[PDB]
Structure 1
Amino acid sequence: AANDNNVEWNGLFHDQGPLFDNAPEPTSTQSVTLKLRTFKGDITSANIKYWDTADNAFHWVPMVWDSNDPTGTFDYWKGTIPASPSIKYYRFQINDGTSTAWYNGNGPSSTEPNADDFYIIPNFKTPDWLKNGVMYQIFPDRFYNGDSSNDVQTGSYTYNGTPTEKKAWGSSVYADPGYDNSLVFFGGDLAGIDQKLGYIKKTLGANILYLNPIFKAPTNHKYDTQDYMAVDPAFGDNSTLQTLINDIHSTANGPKGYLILDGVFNHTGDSHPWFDKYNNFSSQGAYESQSSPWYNYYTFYTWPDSYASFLGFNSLPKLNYGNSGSAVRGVIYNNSNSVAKTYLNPPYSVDGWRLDAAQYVDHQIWSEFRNAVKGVNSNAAIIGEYWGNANPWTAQGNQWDAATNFDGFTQPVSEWITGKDYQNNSASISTTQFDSWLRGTRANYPTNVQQSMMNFLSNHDITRFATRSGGDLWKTYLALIFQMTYVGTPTIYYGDEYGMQGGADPDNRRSFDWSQATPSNSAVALTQKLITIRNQYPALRTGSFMTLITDDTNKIYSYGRFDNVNRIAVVLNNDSVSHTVNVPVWQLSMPNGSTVTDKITGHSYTVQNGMVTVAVDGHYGAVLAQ
């Protein structure tokens, strides 16, 4: 490159990783020094242009030449945005004489963008353990039966005229004729989770557990809460929960762990005493009388049978949060003994809440909720359920730390690798489309939020990845290599690590086959290897992300994860045959003559003419680190 009236887009880079931003989670008094990469000698000037919410105006900061990279291929330019408490948004103007390019979260543009600016949100922190962790999601009835004494039996109780059914471990999840799918119980419990902490924390290496609901409720899924304050007896008691939490937190039995609970705060069950549709309590619920002590906890359109609910399910009546200081806001979060606080305080001290159905609870309520949660424990995580762009609950730093990454992770991964959407409908995307989808969805979020997103291949509300993949376990390998090297918390839905299959609910909640929970299962062996690799390299958790190859002919995707210390080129082959790939590691400033090691195999390579040449099997990958 040269000063030649032309900005060369291929040389340009910025994100908020360590090489480019010295303060990605600044306080009010920390200035933000930003670096923009270009090809060496390519440009004549560059400017940071930032919107300041303090004065509703743009501000321009001229940049200066900072340095070359070690390979001598690139310049870095630098400039500093001043310290203050205000939210700010920035982009770059990049000039080479009569040529101008713009650059922001969406990359380069010939025209000035007005969306996808980078974020500066002073004093907004997400928990660093969430950014750096690996999460394991457990649907408790189906993971491990640690104790038969608490098992629900066939006919133990009835709910809305149907008896419960016990089914044998490993059998079909579908209720036998006459029974109901939501009242089928395999016997998994908290004691079982406790007994399997060595599998989770050592055999795999995950350090965060996320549980589907565990509080008293008549169904097997327990999203129809009857008592927020009691562990459901099928799963244990509150003392079992305390013991489980202390064993999760222990550093003596594996890495220090964290527990995130499912907070079902949009709605209760229809059998909650506040509602009491079936008169299970002496008290009078909202369904029973318009003079009920809890009548105003719900919203009736025509009392008693037409009321607000989750998605039209009459079993899930929607809570009326009223306005600030209301009784409902009190019992859920404000009161010293609220549901949200109770589990965050001793003797529980859980590490976060996953917010079920969170889009149906307004932004004011989530802002108050954040204050309640973070006031007890500033390092307790708040992850909202949302299937789209969760910017409205994340990008001002006043509500959630992150969201369930359906839109930025689960869907594009599904469509690229399996050719199906996550509901197993036909929907395929190319490698260029995959890369574009990923970039646009990252750009929806502040960097800390991106790094804290819950990135799962499957969950309890979508079809299993291994079913979408038609049973080809190598598609799971590929998905795992991507998952464990991408931006956001890798989240393993129990069983995905061994290739568990399953269609739509309830078949996505099969009982876990413990014969497969060893490194003799090749997917488990790869999962363990990848978690070890992710835990070795901060660049994989909090590093920059740069696209390197998007090859739609050979179905090759390559990207770099890199920081001040490490440079890692991930190379993924989404074809059904091997490809030998020339990896442009020069883009990551890996020097000529240096060595890289594929951390999956231990195979070593030498960088030549900016390239590493590696053979990658179909539906597999290499993780080329130095």
Structure 2
Amino acid sequence: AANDNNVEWNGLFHDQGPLFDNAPEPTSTQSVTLKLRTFKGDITSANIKYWDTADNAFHWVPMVWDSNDPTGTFDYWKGTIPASPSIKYYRFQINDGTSTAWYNGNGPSSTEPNADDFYIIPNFKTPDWLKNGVMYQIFPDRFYNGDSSNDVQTGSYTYNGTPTEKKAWGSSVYADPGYDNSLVFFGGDLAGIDQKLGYIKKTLGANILYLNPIFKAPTNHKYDTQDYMAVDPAFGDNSTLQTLINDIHSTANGPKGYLILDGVFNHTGDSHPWFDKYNNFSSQGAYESQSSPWYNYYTFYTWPDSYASFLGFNSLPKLNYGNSGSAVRGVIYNNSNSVAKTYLNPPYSVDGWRLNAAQYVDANGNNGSDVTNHQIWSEFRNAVKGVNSNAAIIGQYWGNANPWTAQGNQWDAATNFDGFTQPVSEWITGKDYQNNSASISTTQFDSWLRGTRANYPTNVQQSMMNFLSNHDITRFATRSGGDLWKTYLALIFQMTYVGTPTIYYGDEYGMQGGADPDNRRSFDWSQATPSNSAVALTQKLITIRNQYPALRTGSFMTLITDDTNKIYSYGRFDNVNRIAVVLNNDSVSHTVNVPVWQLSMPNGSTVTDKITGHSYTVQNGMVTVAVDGHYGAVLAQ
């Protein structure tokens, strides 16, 4: 490069990784020093332009040359944004004579952007164990029956005039005639999970567990809560939970673990004593009497048959959060003996909550996604973080969760459907996560990922729940036609991308299943061993991620987007590590010349494909590696 009235986008780069930001999660008193990369001697001037919420105006901070990278290929321009309590957003204006280019969260641009600027949210912190961990999701009843004595039997009890049905382990999940899909139980419980911690924390290596509902409820999924204060008898009791939490936190059976619980706070089941539609309690619920001490916990349009609920389901009456200081906000999160704080406090001390249907939480029966909804979650945050500043908060949202995270006063992250699940699904399987035809090329994939990451602050990005699938969508293995290689590719990408790798029990070995409830089959433990290639790779990958901080909290730079050969290469890097990931989304093999010079990997230095053990030597900024179709290489140094 040179001073030639031309700013070369290729050399330009910046994100909030260690090399470019010395304060990614600053306090009110820490200033943020930014570094921008450009080809050596490529520009003439560069400036940081930031909008400060303090005075609603833009501010200018001319940058100065700071240094060259070890390979003398790039320049690092420096500039500092002053320390203060206010949220700020910035972008860079890069000049080279008569040529100007802009750069922000969405990369280089010819015209000045007005959205996707980088974020600086003082005092906003997301739990680092979440950024650096690997999560494992479990749908309780279908993981492992560790205690058959608490098993729900056929006919044990009935719900809304329908007996429960028990299935032999491994059988189909669909209810037989006379029964209901939501009342089919396989016997999965807490003792079961406790007995299989070794497989989770050692065989795989995951250090975080997220469980679907485990509180008293009549269904098998349990989102129709009957009592948040008691573990459903079928899964055990509260002391069984205490034991499990102790074994999860234990460092004597593997790495230190963390437990995240599903919080269904937008509604309750219709059989919860506060509502008591079927009169299962001597107390009087809202449905039973307009005098009920809990009458105002709900919204009735025409008492008692017509009332607000979750998406029209009468079994899920919607809670009325009213205004600040309301009884409802008290039992859910404000009171020390509320659902949220009870489990966050001893003798439970869980590590976080997954906010179910979080966007709908509101007052008076409205559907949220408004001021009230956001006011509630920001109070929810103070409450949780007041009890444990390291307790994670991850909300369920299928689109852009920027409105619930970009101000650092609500959730730490969100279920990454839009930023991970969908793009990965369409790129590798040619299907969206509902299994309908939807394909995207590599260039598109890379563009989809960049735009979605730009929707969130860096610490949020690094805390997003990235799963290939879950209890509400179809199995990745099913969307791929059983082609286990597509699972390999998915895993390698998932374990090396930005965000919390999240495995939905079964995906690690390639489990199938279509739309609910078929996406909640019982875990086949004969497949749960390294003899299964998917499992072995999963474990291998998890070890690799835990080995390099760069894969968890490092920068991310796109390296190759080849739609012809279907090759995707990106680099994860920081002050100490440079890692080039090369993915082959094609069905045949391809030899790729990886431009590792982009990550400043010195010539003559060696790299190692952590996935095969095979080592390579960097020569002329490149590294040639052969990669099978639907597979990948993780060149690290």
Q: Distance in 1 between matches of 2:66 and 2:249?
A: 44
Distance 1:14 1:336 in 2: 43
How far has the Cα of 1:330 moved from its partner? 0.5
* Cα drift, residue 291 of structure 1: 1.8
CA distance in 1, matches of 2:265, 2:628: 46
Aligned partner of 2:217 in structure 1 is 217
CA distance in 1, matches of 2:15, 2:263: 33
Secondary structure of 1:372 counterpart: helix
Give the Cα separation in 2 of the matches to 1:20 and 1:334: 39
Per the TM alignment, residue 340 of structure 1 is displaced from its structure 2 partner at its CA by 0.4
Give SS of 2:315's match. Answer: coil
> Residues of 2 paired with 1:34 and 1:493: CA distance?
37
Structure-1 separation of matches of 2:608 and 2:335: 54
- What secondary structure is seen at the aligned counterpart in 1 of 2:317? coil
| Offset of residue 293 of structure 1 | 1.3
Q: Deviations over 1:395-444 (max 9, x none)?
A: 00000000000000000000000000000011000001100000000000
Q: How far did 1:303 drift?
A: 1.6
Give ranges in structure 1 of 5+ residues lacking alignment: none
Q: Paired residue for 2:50?
A: 50
1:167-178 correspondence runs (5 A): 167-178=167-178
Give the distance between the partners of 1:435 and 1:299, measured in 2 at CA.
Answer: 45
Q: CA deviation at 1:609?
A: 1.3
Question: Residue 9 of structure 1: SS of its match in structure 2?
Answer: coil
User: TM-score, normalized by length of structure 2?
Assistant: 0.98
Q: 1-side partners of 2:557 and 2:312: how far apart?
A: 43
1:521 corresponds, among 519, 527, 532, to 532
Partners of 1:434 and 1:310 in 2: how far apart?
A: 33
- 1:523-552 deviation digits (Å, cap 9, x = unpaired): 000000000000000000000000000000
Q: CA deviation at 1:349?
A: 0.2
Deviation (angstroms), 1:97: 1.0
User: What is the distance in 1 between the residues matched to 2:447 and 2:309?
Assistant: 37
- Any idea what SS the aligned residue of 1:605 has? strand
Deviation at 1:305, TM superposition (A): 1.6
Deviations 1:215-261 (A, max 9, x none): 00000000000000000000000000000000000001000000000
Provide the secondary structure at the position in 1 that maps to 2:38.
Answer: strand
* Matched position secondary structure for 1:515: coil
Distance 1:417 1:501 in 2: 16
Are residues 1:378 and 2:392 paired? no
* Poorly superposed stretches of 4+, deviation over 6 Å: none
**What's the RMSD between the two structures over aligned residues?**
0.5
1:184 Cα offset (Å): 0.1
Q: How big is the shift at 1:279?
A: 1.0
Supply the distance in 2 between the matched residues of 1:368 and 1:222 (Cα, whole angstroms).
26
Q: Secondary structure at the match of 1:316?
A: strand
Structure 1 residue 361, shift from structure 2 partner: 1.7
Deviations 1:154-185 (A, max 9, x none): 00000000000000000000011111000000
CA deviation after TM superposition for structure 1 residue 263, in Å: 0.3
Count residues in correspondence. 625
Q: CA deviation at 1:372?
A: 0.4
Q: What whole-Å deviation, never above 9, does each CA across 1:17-72 have from its counterpart, x for those lacking one?
A: 00000000001111100000000000000000000111111000000001010111
CA distance in 2, matches of 1:388, 1:286: 34
How far off its partner does 1:608 sit?
Answer: 1.2
Return the alpha-carbon distance in structure 2 between the equivalents of residues 604 and 331 of structure 1.
Answer: 57
Moved more, 221-230 or 285-294: 285-294
- Report SS of the residue matched to 1:416: helix
1:75 alignment partner in structure 2 = 75
Between the aligned partners of 1:494 and 1:263, the Cα distance in structure 2 is: 19
CA distance in 2, matches of 1:307, 1:567: 57
Which stretch of structure 1 is more off in the superposition, 298-307 or 605-614? 298-307
Q: Distance in 2 between matches of 1:306 and 1:477?
A: 49
TM-fit CA distance, 1:300: 1.2
Give the Å deviation of 1:10.
0.6
Counterpart CA distance in 2 for 1:178 and 1:548 is 57
Query: Which secondary structure state, in structure 2, belongs to the residue aligned with residue 516 of structure 1?
Result: coil
Residue 106 of structure 2 is aligned to residue 106 of structure 1? yes
Cα drift, residue 151 of structure 1: 0.1
Equivalent residue, structure 1, for 2:347: 347
SS in 2 for 1:293: coil
1:614 matched residue in structure 2: 625
Partner-residue secondary structure (3-state), 2:383: helix
What is the percent sequence identity of the aligned residues?
100
Counterpart for residue 325 of structure 1 = 325
Q: Distance in 2 between matches of 1:293 and 1:418?
A: 52
- Listed one character per residue, the Cα deviations across residues 175-221 of structure 1 (whole Å, up to 9, x for unaligned) are 11111000000000000000000000000000000000000000000
**TM-score, with normalisation over the residues of structure 1?**
0.99
- SS, match of residue 537 in structure 2: helix
**What is the DSSP-based 3-state SS (H/G/I as helix, E as strand, rest coil) of the residue aligned with 1:4?**
coil
Structure 2 residue matching 1:474: 3-state secondary structure = helix
Taking the aligned partners of 1:272 and 1:155, their CA distance within structure 2 comes to 21
2:593 paired with 1:548: no
CA distance in 2, matches of 1:307, 1:58: 48
Task: Give the distance between the partners of 1:290 and 1:150, measured in 2 at CA.
Answer: 37
What SS is found at the alignment partner of 1:496? coil
**Distance of 2:90 and 2:305 partners within structure 1:** 51
Aligned partners of 1:548, 1:232: CA distance in 2, in Å?
50
Q: Displacement, 1:285?
A: 1.0
Structure 2 equivalent of residue 290 of structure 1: 290
- Structure 2 residues without counterparts, runs of 5 or longer: 363-374
Give the C-alpha shift of residue 311 in structure 1: 1.0
Q: Summarize deviations over 1:269-313 as a string: whole Å, max 9, x none.
A: 000011111111111111112222111111111221221111111
Q: Describe the SS at the equivalent of 2:452.
A: helix
Secondary structure of the 2:296 match is: helix
The C-alpha deviation readout for 1:56-97, integer Å capped at 9, x for no partner, is 110000000010101111000000000111100000000001
